[PDB]
From Swiss-Prot:
SUPFAM superfamilies recorded: Lysozyme-like (SSF53955)
EC assignment: 3.2.1.17
SMART domains: LYZ1
A single cellular component GO annotation: endoplasmic reticulum
Miscellaneous comment text of the record: Lysozyme C is capable of both hydrolysis and transglycosylation; it also shows a slight esterase activity. It acts rapidly on both peptide-substituted and unsubstituted peptidoglycan, and slowly on chitin oligosaccharides.
InterPro entries: Glyco_hydro_22, Glyco_hydro_22_CS, Glyco_hydro_22_lys, Lysozyme-like_dom_sf
The protein's assembly and partners: Monomer.
Role: Lysozymes have primarily a bacteriolytic function; those in tissues and body fluids are associated with the monocyte-macrophage system and enhance the activity of immunoagents. Has bacteriolytic activity against M.luteus.
Active-site residues per Swiss-Prot or TrEMBL entry: 35, 52
Annotated source species: Gallus gallus
Reactions mediated catalytically: Hydrolysis of (1->4)-beta-linkages between N-acetylmuramic acid and N-acetyl-D-glucosamine residues in a peptidoglycan and between N-acetyl-D-glucosamine residues in chitodextrins
Protein name according to UniProt: Lysozyme C
Amino acid sequence: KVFGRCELAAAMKRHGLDNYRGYSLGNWVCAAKFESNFNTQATNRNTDGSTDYGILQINSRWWCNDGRTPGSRNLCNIPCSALLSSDITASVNCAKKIVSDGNGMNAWVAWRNRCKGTDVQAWIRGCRL
Ligand SMILES: [Cl-]
Ligand SMILES: [Cl-]
Ligand code: NA
C-alpha cells in the first residue's frame, strides 16, 4: 500500500509515535518518505547481504528474520515479511524498539541525512490530526 502523507501521519499518531522518545510526528513521516516513499512493500538489499523491509526500511541483519541473512538477529521477533503489510502495526512496534536502543533515529540513514535539523513539522502541515 502506498500511503498518502496525512494518511500515514494519522496512522502513526494512532500507533503512539508522536513524540515517542522525544521525536515529533514530522520526523517519522519524513523518514518514511525518504526510506520507502510511503510504500509498505519497499525492499532494498544491502551490500552485506541483509535486506531492508517496509515503510521504515527495517534491516534483517538485526531486527527481523528473513531466512537468508546468515548470522543475523531477530530482535523484533518477527518475520521480515510482516513488515510489508498494509497494516503498519508491526513496523511501528519494531521501530519503537530500534529508536530506544541508544542511537535514536540516527539508525535511519535517510533520517540523519535528509530530515535531521530540517523543518520536519512541514511534513504534517495541513493534516487533520
Ligand atoms: Cl512534527
Ligand atoms: Cl534520542
Ligand atoms: Na535477521
